[PDB]
C-alpha cells in the first residue's frame, strides 16, 4: 500500500502551497531593504510565483489519484464503536499497531547502523538444513532442489531462468565450492564436476566463489544464505553494462555491489 | 454520500478558481490604493472586502488538508489491520477475533512493561 | 592473586559483549511480529520473551560486574600513581620462561601429531574420492 | 453576545481542559470507562444537542424555545434529557406523573450513560425510541436498575442501539426496530451478554418476546412465555432471572 506515501506527498505539497502563499504575501508586505543600485529583489517576487507554480505540483496528485475506491468497511476495525457500546475501555489496538511499527523501524535502523561491530573475537542438523533450503526456495523463478547423492554434506542446485544452472556444496552452512554450468549437467548418475564453460561462466563461478568467501559471516547462516540467494538471483537479466559499452570483453557481468556493470572493472 | 477522492476532485478546481479570483481582487485593490494614494483618484468604484477572499481560501485549504489526512489515516489503518490480523470478517468468529485482539493488546503491554523494567534496571 | 591486567582485559571483553548483546537484542526485537499473525500464537512468542528476559538479566549482571571492575581499577591506584609513561610511550621470570619453552615444545609435538592426523584424514578423503 | 472572540488562557489550565480524564465533573462513580476530554465532552454534548434537536423537529413532537434548549417533554409530563451546564452540572428536575417517582431519575441516568462519551450517535436513535409509556414504565425502570444501578456473568448489563450492529450474531436482522404502537410491538429492549453473548429477539404480541446458545435460549424463552406466571408488562424481572441463571 504505497498510496499512503502518495497521500503524504500530496499533504506536504498542499502545505507547501499554503506556506508559499503566506511567504509571498509576507514578502509583498515589505519593500527594498537596501538595494542602492536597482530594486532587483522584485524579481524574487516572480521567483515566489514559481513556488506558487508548485501548486501545479499538487496537480501531479491527479496522476497519483484514484488510489483507494473499494468496499472493505475499514478492514475489520470496528469492534466497540460499531459494536458493543459498553465495550469502551478499542483504540488500544491502533496504539499497539503504531507501537509495533515504530519498534520495527527503530530496530531495523539500529541493526542497519550496527554494522560497525565491536567484538574482537570469541575468547576469554540435516533437517534444519533442508528446512532452510526449502524456505529459501520460496522465491519465484528460483526453482532449486537438493538430493545429497554423496556424503552428509548438502548438494544443492539452482535453475532460475536459463540452462545456466549452478551447484553449490554446503556443510549445513557457508556453501563453498561453487560450480556454474551453462547448458549442461548431472551426468553419470548424480552431480558432476566438469566445470566446463565458455571462458565467461567460469568467470561467473570465480565471482561466486569470491562472494562466498566475501559474504561469509561469523554466525547466523540464515542471513548468509539469504544474501547468497539474492546475489545469485541478481543475474536474471545480463543485458546491461554501465560505466562502459556492452562489449568491454567477452561478456560484462559482475554485480558484486548490488548493481551489474561492465566486467574487468574491479 | 461523498467519497474522499470525489471531494478532493471537486474541491481542487474550486480552490484554483478561488485563488485566481482572490489574486485578481488583490491586484485590483492594490492598483486602486496606489491610484488613490500615489496619483489622482481615477478608480471611482468601490472595491471588495478582500478579507473574505483569502479567508475562504485558507478555509478550503484546511478542509482539503484534513480530508486528505483522514484518507491517509484510513489507508494506514487498513494496512496495519491487514498486517496485524488476517482478512476475515462477517470469515472469522467475532468473539474469537475480540479475544485475539485482547490477547494481542495484553502481549504488547507485557513487552512494553518488560522493556520498561529493563530500562529501570539500567538506571 | 592480583590478576589486574587480566581484570582489565575481562572488562574490555565485557563491554564488547555488552555491545554485542545490544546488537543481538535489537536483531531479536526487529523480528517480533504480531502475535496472531499466522501460527506463532504464544509458543515462539513466549520463547523469545523468556530469551530476552535472560538477555536482560545477563546484561544487568554484566553491568554489575563492569561497575565492580571499574571500582577495582580505581582502587588499584596504589604506588606509582601518576605513571606518566602513558604520554611517554616508547618510540622468577626464568622459571616462567622455561615453563613457556616446555609448553611450546609439547605444543610442537602435538602439532606434529596433528599433522600426521590430518595427513591420514586427507588420505581417507582420497579413498572416498575413489568411492562409488 | 452570541459568539466567542479570542478568549485567553494563561497556564497549565489549558492542560487541565486537555488531558482526557475519566472524571466527568462530579464523577458519581456509578459508571465511567473511557478517558473523556473536557473539550471532547463539550463538543460531543453540543453535537448531540444539535442532532437530537434536528431529529425532534424531524419526526416527533417539539417544545418551545428558552435559554437552555429543552425538547425533552415526555408523554404525560417530564423534561430531563440534556446536560445544559455540562461543565457545571446536569440539573433538570421538571416533573413526573407516573414512575417510568425515582424511576424518572433512573431513566435520566440511563439516557446520560447512553450519551456519555459520544463513541457514536446511537444514543440519539435510542432516546428517540423512548416514546412508549406502556411496556416501558416499570419494565424500563427495572432495565435501568439492572443496567448501571449496582444490582445484586451474574446478569451482566448488555444494551445496544447501533445500525446493523455486527456484535450480535446475525440470524434475522430486520430493518430498524425501534417502536411499534400496534399488535406486534417491535421493541429491541437491549442486547444480551453473559460472562459470551447472543442476540435478544423480542416482539410484543400484546393481544414481551414472542420470538449453541441459539439452540437453547429461544426454546427456554418460549417455554417461559408459555408459562407466563413467572415473577400488562412483557418481561420485566423474569428476563433478568433468565439472563442471570437460565443463561447457562
Swiss-Prot record, chain A:
<dbReference type="GO" id="GO:0032968">
    <property type="term" value="P:positive regulation of transcription elongation by RNA polymerase II"/>
</dbReference>
<dbReference type="GO" id="GO:0006357">
    <property type="term" value="P:regulation of transcription by RNA polymerase II"/>
</dbReference>
<dbReference type="GO" id="GO:0060261">
    <property type="term" value="P:positive regulation of transcription initiation by RNA polymerase II"/>
</dbReference>
<keyword id="KW-0804">Transcription</keyword>
<dbReference type="GO" id="GO:0003713">
    <property type="term" value="F:transcription coactivator activity"/>
</dbReference>
<dbReference type="GO" id="GO:0005667">
    <property type="term" value="C:transcription regulator complex"/>
</dbReference>
<dbReference type="InterPro" id="IPR021627">
    <property type="entry name" value="Mediator_Med27"/>
</dbReference>
<comment type="function">
    <text>Component of the Mediator complex, a coactivator involved in the regulated transcription of nearly all RNA polymerase II-dependent genes. Mediator functions as a bridge to convey information from gene-specific regulatory proteins to the basal RNA polymerase II transcription machinery. Mediator is recruited to promoters by direct interactions with regulatory proteins and serves as a scaffold for the assembly of a functional preinitiation complex with RNA polymerase II and the general transcription factors.</text>
</comment>
<keyword id="KW-0539">Nucleus</keyword>
<dbReference type="GO" id="GO:0061630">
    <property type="term" value="F:ubiquitin protein ligase activity"/>
</dbReference>
<dbReference type="GO" id="GO:0005829">
    <property type="term" value="C:cytosol"/>
</dbReference>
<dbReference type="GO" id="GO:0005730">
    <property type="term" value="C:nucleolus"/>
</dbReference>
Curated annotation (Swiss-Prot), chain B:
<keyword id="KW-0007">Acetylation</keyword>
<dbReference type="GO" id="GO:0005634">
    <property type="term" value="C:nucleus"/>
</dbReference>
<dbReference type="GO" id="GO:0051123">
    <property type="term" value="P:RNA polymerase II preinitiation complex assembly"/>
</dbReference>
<keyword id="KW-0010">Activator</keyword>
<keyword id="KW-0805">Transcription regulation</keyword>
<comment type="subunit">
    <text>Component of the Mediator complex, which is composed of MED1, MED4, MED6, MED7, MED8, MED9, MED10, MED11, MED12, MED13, MED13L, MED14, MED15, MED16, MED17, MED18, MED19, MED20, MED21, MED22, MED23, MED24, MED25, MED26, MED27, MED29, MED30, MED31, CCNC, CDK8 and CDC2L6/CDK11. The MED12, MED13, CCNC and CDK8 subunits form a distinct module termed the CDK8 module. Mediator containing the CDK8 module is less active than Mediator lacking this module in supporting transcriptional activation.</text>
</comment>
<keyword id="KW-0539">Nucleus</keyword>
<dbReference type="GO" id="GO:0060261">
    <property type="term" value="P:positive regulation of transcription initiation by RNA polymerase II"/>
</dbReference>
<protein>
    <recommendedName>
        <fullName>Mediator of RNA polymerase II transcription subunit 29</fullName>
    </recommendedName>
</protein>
<dbReference type="GO" id="GO:0016592">
    <property type="term" value="C:mediator complex"/>
</dbReference>
<comment type="function">
    <text>Component of the Mediator complex, a coactivator involved in the regulated transcription of nearly all RNA polymerase II-dependent genes. Mediator functions as a bridge to convey information from gene-specific regulatory proteins to the basal RNA polymerase II transcription machinery. Mediator is recruited to promoters by direct interactions with regulatory proteins and serves as a scaffold for the assembly of a functional preinitiation complex with RNA polymerase II and the general transcription factors.</text>
</comment>
<keyword id="KW-0804">Transcription</keyword>
From Swiss-Prot, chain C:
<dbReference type="GO" id="GO:0016592">
    <property type="term" value="C:mediator complex"/>
</dbReference>
<keyword id="KW-0010">Activator</keyword>
<comment type="subunit">
    <text>Component of the Mediator complex, which is composed of MED1, MED4, MED6, MED7, MED8, MED9, MED10, MED11, MED12, MED13, MED13L, MED14, MED15, MED16, MED17, MED18, MED19, MED20, MED21, MED22, MED23, MED24, MED25, MED26, MED27, MED29, MED30, MED31, CCNC, CDK8 and CDC2L6/CDK11. The MED12, MED13, CCNC and CDK8 subunits form a distinct module termed the CDK8 module. Mediator containing the CDK8 module is less active than Mediator lacking this module in supporting transcriptional activation.</text>
</comment>
<comment type="function">
    <text>Component of the Mediator complex, a coactivator involved in the regulated transcription of nearly all RNA polymerase II-dependent genes. Mediator functions as a bridge to convey information from gene-specific regulatory proteins to the basal RNA polymerase II transcription machinery. Mediator is recruited to promoters by direct interactions with regulatory proteins and serves as a scaffold for the assembly of a functional preinitiation complex with RNA polymerase II and the general transcription factors.</text>
</comment>
<keyword id="KW-0175">Coiled coil</keyword>
<keyword id="KW-0539">Nucleus</keyword>
<dbReference type="GO" id="GO:0035019">
    <property type="term" value="P:somatic stem cell population maintenance"/>
</dbReference>
<dbReference type="InterPro" id="IPR021019">
    <property type="entry name" value="Mediator_Med30_met"/>
</dbReference>
<dbReference type="GO" id="GO:0005654">
    <property type="term" value="C:nucleoplasm"/>
</dbReference>
<feature type="coiled-coil region">
    <location>
        <begin position="92"/>
        <end position="127"/>
    </location>
</feature>
<dbReference type="GO" id="GO:0061630">
    <property type="term" value="F:ubiquitin protein ligase activity"/>
</dbReference>
<dbReference type="GO" id="GO:0060261">
    <property type="term" value="P:positive regulation of transcription initiation by RNA polymerase II"/>
</dbReference>
Swiss-Prot record, chain D:
<feature type="short sequence motif" description="LXXLL motif 2">
    <location>
        <begin position="14"/>
        <end position="18"/>
    </location>
</feature>
<comment type="subunit">
    <text>Component of the Mediator complex, which is composed of MED1, MED4, MED6, MED7, MED8, MED9, MED10, MED11, MED12, MED13, MED13L, MED14, MED15, MED16, MED17, MED18, MED19, MED20, MED21, MED22, MED23, MED24, MED25, MED26, MED27, MED29, MED30, MED31, CCNC, CDK8 and CDC2L6/CDK11. The MED12, MED13, CCNC and CDK8 subunits form a distinct module termed the CDK8 module. Mediator containing the CDK8 module is less active than Mediator lacking this module in supporting transcriptional activation.</text>
</comment>
<comment type="function">
    <text>Component of the Mediator complex, a coactivator involved in the regulated transcription of nearly all RNA polymerase II-dependent genes. Mediator functions as a bridge to convey information from gene-specific regulatory proteins to the basal RNA polymerase II transcription machinery. Mediator is recruited to promoters by direct interactions with regulatory proteins and serves as a scaffold for the assembly of a functional preinitiation complex with RNA polymerase II and the general transcription factors.</text>
</comment>
<comment type="similarity">
    <text>Belongs to the Mediator complex subunit 14 family.</text>
</comment>
<protein>
    <recommendedName>
        <fullName>Mediator of RNA polymerase II transcription subunit 14</fullName>
    </recommendedName>
</protein>
Amino acid at each position: 500500500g504505497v498510496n499512503l506515501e502518495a497521500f503524504s506527498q500530496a499533504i506536504s505539497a498542499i502545505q507547501a502551497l499554503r506556506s508559499s502563499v503566506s511567504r509571498v504575501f509576507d514578502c509583498l508586505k515589505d519593500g527594498m531593504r537596501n538595494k542602492e543600485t536597482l530594486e532587483g529583489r522584485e524579481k524574487a517576487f516572480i521567483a515566489n510565483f514559481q513556488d506558487n507554480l508548485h501548486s501545479v505540483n499538487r496537480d501531479l496528485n491527479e496522476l497519483e489519484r484514484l488510489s483507494n475506491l473499494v468496499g472493505k468497511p475499514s478492514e475489520n476495525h470496528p469492534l466497540h464503536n460499531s459494536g458493543l457500546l459498553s465495550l469502551d475501555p478499542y483504540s488500544q489496538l491502533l496504539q499497539a499497531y503504531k507501537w509495533s511499527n515504530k519498534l520495527q523501524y527503530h530496530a531495523g535502523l539500529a541493526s542497519g547502523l550496527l554494522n560497525q561491530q565491536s567484538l574482537k573475537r570469541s575468547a576469554n542438523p540435516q533437517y534444519v538444513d533442508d528446512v532452510i533450503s526449502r524456505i529459501d526456495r520460496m522465491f519465484p523463478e528460483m526453482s532449486i532442489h537438493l538430493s545429497r547423492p554423496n556424503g552428509t554434506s548438502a548438494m544443492l542446485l539452482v535453475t532460475l531462468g536459463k540452462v545456466l544452472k549452478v551447484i553449490v556444496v554446503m556443510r549445513s552452512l557457508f556453501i563453498d565450492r561453487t560450480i556454474v554450468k551453462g547448458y549442461n549437467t548431472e551426468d553419470g548418475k548424480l552431480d558432476i564436476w566438469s566445470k566446463s564453460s565458455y571462458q565467461v561462466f567460469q568467470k561467473v563461478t570465480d565471482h561466486a566463489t569470491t562472494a562466498l568467501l566475501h559474504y561469509q559471516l561469523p554466525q547466523m547462516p540464515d542471513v548468509v544464505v539469504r544474501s547468497f540467494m539474492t546475489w545469485l538471483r541478481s543475474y536474471i537479466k545480463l543485458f546491461q553494462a554501465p560505466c562502459q559499452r556492452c562489449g568491454k570483453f567477452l561478456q560484462d557481468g559482475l554485480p558484486p555491489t548490488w548493481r551489474d556493470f561492465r566486467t574487468l572493472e574491479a | 454520500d461523498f467519497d474522499p477522492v470525489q471531494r478532493y476532485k471537486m474541491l481542487i478546481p474550486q480552490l484554483k478558481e478561488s485563488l485566481q479570483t482572490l489574486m485578481k481582487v488583490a491586484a485590483q485593490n492594490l492598483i486602486q490604493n496606489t491610484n488613490i494614494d500615489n496619483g489622482q483618484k481615477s478608480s471611482d468604484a468601490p472595491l471588495q472586502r478582500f478579507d473574505k477572499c483569502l479567508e475562504e481560501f485558507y478555509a478550503l485549504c484546511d478542509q482539503l488538508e484534513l480530508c486528505l489526512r483522514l484518507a491517509h489515516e484510513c489507508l494506514s489503518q487498513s494496512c496495519d489491520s491487514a498486517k496485524h490480523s488476517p482478512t476475515l470478517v462477517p470469515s472469522l468468529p467475532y468473539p474469537q477475533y475480540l479475544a485475539v485482539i485482547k490477547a494481542q493488546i495484553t502481549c504488547a503491554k507485557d513487552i512494553h512493561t518488560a522493556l520498561l523494567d529493563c530500562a529501570n534496571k539500567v538506571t | 592473586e592480583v590478576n589486574t591486567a587480566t581484570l582489565c582485559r575481562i572488562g574490555q571483553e565485557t563491554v564488547q559483549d555488552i555491545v554485542y548483546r545490544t546488537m543481538e537484542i535489537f536483531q531479536l526485537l526487529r523480528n517480533m511480529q504480531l502475535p496472531n499473525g499466522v501460527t506463532y500464537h504464544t509458543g515462539t512468542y513466549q520463547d523469545r520473551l523468556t530469551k530476552l528476559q535472560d538477555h536482560l538479566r545477563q546484561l544487568s549482571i554484566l553491568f554489575r560486574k563492569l561497575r565492580l571492575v571499574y571500582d577495582k581499577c580505581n582502587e588499584n591506584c596504589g604506588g606509582m600513581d601518576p605513571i606518566p609513561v602513558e604520554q611517554l610511550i616508547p618510540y622468577e621470570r626464568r622459571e616462567i620462561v622455561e615453563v613457556n619453552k616446555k609448553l611450546k615444545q609439547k605444543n610442537q609435538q602435538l602439532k606434529q601429531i596433528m599433522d600426521q592426523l590430518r595427513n591420514l584424514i586427507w588420505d581417507i578423503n582420497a579413498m572416498l574420492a575413489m568411492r562409488n | 453576545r452570541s459568539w466567542a472572540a479570542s478568549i485567553p488562557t494563561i497556564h497549565s489550565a489549558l492542560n487541565i481542559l486537555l488531558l482526557p480524564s475519566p472524571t466527568p465533573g462530579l464523577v458519581p462513580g456509578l459508571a465511567g470507562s473511557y478517558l473523556c476530554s473536557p473539550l471532547e465532552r463539550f463538543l460531543g454534548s453540543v453535537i448531540m444537542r444539535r442532532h437530537l434537536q434536528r431529529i425532534i423537529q424531524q419526526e416527533t413532537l417539539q417544545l418551545i424555545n428558552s435559554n437552555e434548549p429543552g425538547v425533552i417533554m415526555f408523554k404525560t409530563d417530564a423534561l430531563k434529557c440534556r446536560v445544559a451546564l455540562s461543565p457545571k452540572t446536569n440539573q433538570t428536575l421538571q416533573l413526573k406523573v407516573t414512575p417510568e417517582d425515582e424511576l424518572q431519575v433512573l431513566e435520566k441516568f440511563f439516557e446520560t450513560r447512553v450519551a456519555g462519551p459520544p463513541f457514536k450517535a446511537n444514543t440519539l436513535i435510542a432516546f428517540t425510541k423512548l416514546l412508549g409509556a406502556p411496556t416501558h414504565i416499570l419494565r424500563d425502570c427495572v432495565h435501568i436498575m439492572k443496567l448501571e444501578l449496582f444490582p445484586d456473568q451474574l446478569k451482566w448489563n448488555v444494551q445496544f442501539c447501533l445500525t446493523i450492529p455486527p456484535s450480535a450474531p446475525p440470524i434475522a436482522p430486520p430493518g430498524t426496530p425501534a417502536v411499534v404502537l400496534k399488535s406486534k410491538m417491535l421493541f429491541f429492549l437491549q442486547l444480551t451478554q453473559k460472562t459470551v453473548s447472543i442476540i435478544v429477539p423480542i416482539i410484543y404480541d400484546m393481544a414481551t418476546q414472542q420470538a449453541n446458545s441459539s439452540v437453547a435460549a429461544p426454546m427456554m424463552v418460549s417455554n417461559i412465555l408459555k408459562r407466563f406466571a413467572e415473577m400488562r408488562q412483557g418481561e420485566c424481572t423474569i428476563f433478568a432471572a433468565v439472563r442471570d441463571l437460565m443463561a447457562n
